[PDB]
Structure 1
Amino acid sequence: SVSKANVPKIDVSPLFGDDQAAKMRVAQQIDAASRDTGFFYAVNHGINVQRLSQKTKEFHMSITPEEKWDLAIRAYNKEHQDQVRAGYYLSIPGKKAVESFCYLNPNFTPDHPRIQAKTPTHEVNVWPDETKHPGFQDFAEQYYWDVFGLSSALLKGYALALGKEENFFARHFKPDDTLASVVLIRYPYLDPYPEAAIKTAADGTKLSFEWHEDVSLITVLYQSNVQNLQVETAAGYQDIEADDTGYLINCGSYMAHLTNNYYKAPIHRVKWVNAERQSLPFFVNLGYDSVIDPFDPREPNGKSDREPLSYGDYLQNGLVSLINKNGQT
């Protein structure tokens, strides 16, 4: 068998308040988890995840094939050349099992300055018809702001953990320009499950998605209570237990770059499981021009031999590279 990964449950409620000492004790826990397996569960986070799962299930089980083509990204529908990130990512029965819907900042409207300039990685969200999916757009936009609020609190914890002031990351994570995305992923139960939709790791483990590091500053994930994720540690790939009451948090490769690998972006993968389940990540991305000067918390002067990288440059290059490595989702 595979050993259980050490994934501590951290009560992050002090990060929403004004007790500075309490916030430092949470930051220490984040530091420990970031230096160990790289994963932790944020608990006492204040978000109604049962309602999120219910609203997402109502959407996934009622959307029709017609609506999926009408909302599809350009990888599936050549008529939609402006949709690279936002929209519907179709399944391919007999070949690709997963399907999903991605949306970006609700403030990316037609009049937004970055939308007017046609700056890469910024798009105006696409939504299904209101009469067919009553309340879905409003729920989904409010969810973006609820998880943005949790993510801002978590970024204060990471900043304190690295010896910085609490707004070190959060000052670059703003409602008017964040490149953060929500993905509503559906993994289906299929009988017979297409072998073409199952990948096989070098160690023989059946997978739905291969090893990778995330393209994010941090990733804030809600998933159904079905075990599936694995993390590579020095002692091999270990199973991350499921917890559908908490948010699973890990660092992405932008955090590894900024900290000179002090907080590594953990390598992880998704096991194949024949179960109807949900995976709802929020990728915490900064603004297009956000540049944080790289540093090293293990060195006395804190200097690093890494060059500054704008978040926009990092993101555009990273999303393409992940598709090339592990396939179009």
Structure 2
Amino acid sequence: SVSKANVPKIDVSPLFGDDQAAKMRVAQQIDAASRDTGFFYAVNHGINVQRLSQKTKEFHMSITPEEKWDLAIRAYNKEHQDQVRAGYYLSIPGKKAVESFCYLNPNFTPDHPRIQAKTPTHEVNVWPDETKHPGFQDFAEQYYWDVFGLSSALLKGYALALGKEENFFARHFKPDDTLASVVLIRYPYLDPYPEAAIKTAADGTKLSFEWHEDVSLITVLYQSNVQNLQVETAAGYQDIEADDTGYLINCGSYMAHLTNNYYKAPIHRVKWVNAERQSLPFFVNLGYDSVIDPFDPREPNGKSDREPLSYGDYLQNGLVSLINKNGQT
């Protein structure tokens, strides 16, 4: 069997308060986890994840095929040319088992300057009919802000961990402009489970999603309590334990770029499991024009030979590349 990955549980509650020394002790834990497997569980995070799961299940189990077409992104519905990121990602029974619903910043409204400009990666969210899904949009928008708040706290810990002031990332992570996304992914139980919907790794492991690094600064994930993720390490792919009270945190490739791989974006993959479950990531993205000068916390003078990259350039290029590599979700 594969060995268990070292995924420590870190109590992040000090990151919400004003005890600077305690924040440093959290930052050290983040540093250690980021230098090791690249994953940790954030605990004492303050979010009601059980309610998140319940509301998400009520949505996934009640939405109809009709509504899925009507919410579909462009990849599934040519009539919806503005929906590149936000909307419904359909399953293809017999071929693609997973389905999902993505939404973006609720502040991306029709009058937002980036929406008026039609700037890439910005879109106005689409939502199902309120009468068919009472309370869902309100719940989902509030969840965006709850996980935004946790993410801001986590970003203060990553900044302190890297030797920076606590707002070093967080000053570029703003309610009015963040490109962050929530994805409500449904993995189904299927009997029989179609082989075409199961991928196979070079080591023989059955997978739902192949190896990748995340397109994010950090990723802040709630999943059901069903083991499925693996992380590549020196010792091969290792299993990340489940814990559906904590949030699983890892860095994405923008952090790797900014830190000159001090905090790598861990390569990870999703095992095939025949289970009805949920995967609810929040991809922590900055603003379109956010640029942080790359640095190197292993170099005496802190300098890096990487060029600055705006977050919008990073994101637009990354999302396309991930689809080309691992397929349209």
Task: Give TM class, smaller chain.
Answer: over 0.9
**What displacement does 1:8 show?**
0.1
| d(CA) in 1 for partners of 2:93, 2:235 | 37
* In 2, Cα distance between equivalents of 1:194 and 1:167: 48
Following superposition, the deviation at residue 104 of structure 1 comes to: 0.1
Query: How far apart are 1:136 and its partner, in Å?
Result: 0.1
Q: Distance in 2 between matches of 1:61 and 1:280?
A: 15
Q: Deviations over 1:13-35 (max 9, x none)?
A: 00000000000000000000000
Deviation at 1:166, TM superposition (A): 0.1
Q: 2:321 matched to which residue of 1?
A: 321
Q: Which runs of 5+ in 1 are unaligned?
A: none
Q: Secondary structure at the match of 1:296?
A: coil
Q: Distance in 1 between matches of 2:148 and 2:12?
A: 14
| Partner deviation per Cα, 1:274-299 (whole Å, 9 max, x = no partner) | 00000000000000000000000000
The 2-side partners of 1:245 and 1:181 are apart by: 21
Q: What does residue 155 of structure 1 align with?
A: 155
Separation in structure 1 between the aligned mates of residue 209 and residue 184 of structure 2, nearest angstrom: 16
- Report deviation, 1:165: 0.1
Provide the rounded CA distance (Å) in 2 between the counterparts of 1:78 and 1:32: 46
Structure 1 distance, partners of 2:266, 2:247, is: 16
How many residues align structurally?
Answer: 329
1:198-217 residue CA offsets vs partner (Å, 9 max, x unmatched): 00000000000000000000
Q: State the 1:239 CA deviation.
A: 0.1
Output the CA distance in 1 between the equivalents of 2:197 and 2:27: 40
C-alpha deviations, 1:23-74, integer Å up to 9, x for none?
Answer: 0000000000000000000000000000000000000000000000000000
Distance across 2 between alignment mates of 1:222 and 1:320:
24
The Cα shift of 1:108 comes to: 0.1
Question: What is the rounded CA distance, in whole Å, between the counterparts of 2:118 and 2:70 in structure 1?
Answer: 22
User: Take 1:2 and 1:103, find their aligned partners in 2: how far apart are those partners?
Assistant: 35
Q: Distance in 1 between matches of 2:66 and 2:147?
A: 30
Superposed displacement of residue 231, structure 1: 0.1
- Residue 306 of structure 1 corresponds to 306
Partners of 1:139 and 1:211 lie apart in 2 by 32
* Structure 2: distance between partners of 1:211 and 1:58: 30
Task: State how far apart, in whole Å, the 1-side matches of 2:168 and 2:36 are.
Answer: 23
| Aligned mates of 1:286, 1:93 — CA distance in 2 | 35
Between the aligned partners of 1:225 and 1:327, the Cα distance in structure 2 is 26
Quick one: distance in 1 between partners of 2:58 and 2:200?
A: 32
Q: Distance in 2 between matches of 1:94 and 1:56?
A: 24
Q: Distance in 2 between matches of 1:133 and 1:164?
A: 44
Does the residue aligned with 1:67 lie in a helix, a strand or coil? helix
Alpha-carbon distance in 2 for matches of 1:184, 1:94: 21
- Residues of 2 paired with 1:276 and 1:167: CA distance? 39
| 2: CA distance, partners of 1:144 / 1:211 | 27
Post-superposition, which runs of at least 4 consecutive aligned residues in structure 1 deviate over 6 A?
none
Q: For residues 116-165 of structure 1, what are the alpha-carbon distances to aligned partners after superposition, in whole Å with 9 as ceiling and x for unaligned?
A: 00000000000000000000000000000000000000000000000000
1 CA distance for matches of 2:7 and 2:322? 25
CA–CA distance in 2 between the matches of 1:119 and 1:156? Answer: 28
Task: Give the superposition deviation at 1:311.
Answer: 0.1
Aligned-residue RMSD, C-alpha: 0.1
Q: Alignment identity in percent?
A: 100
In the alignment, does 2:70 pair up with 1:70?
yes
Identify unmatched segments of 5+ residues in structure 2. Answer: none
What is the 5 A alignment of 1:47-196? 47-196=47-196
- Paired with 1:94 and 1:40, the residues of 2 have a C-alpha distance of 35
In structure 2, what is the equivalent of residue 26 of structure 1?
26
Q: CA deviation at 1:100?
A: 0.1
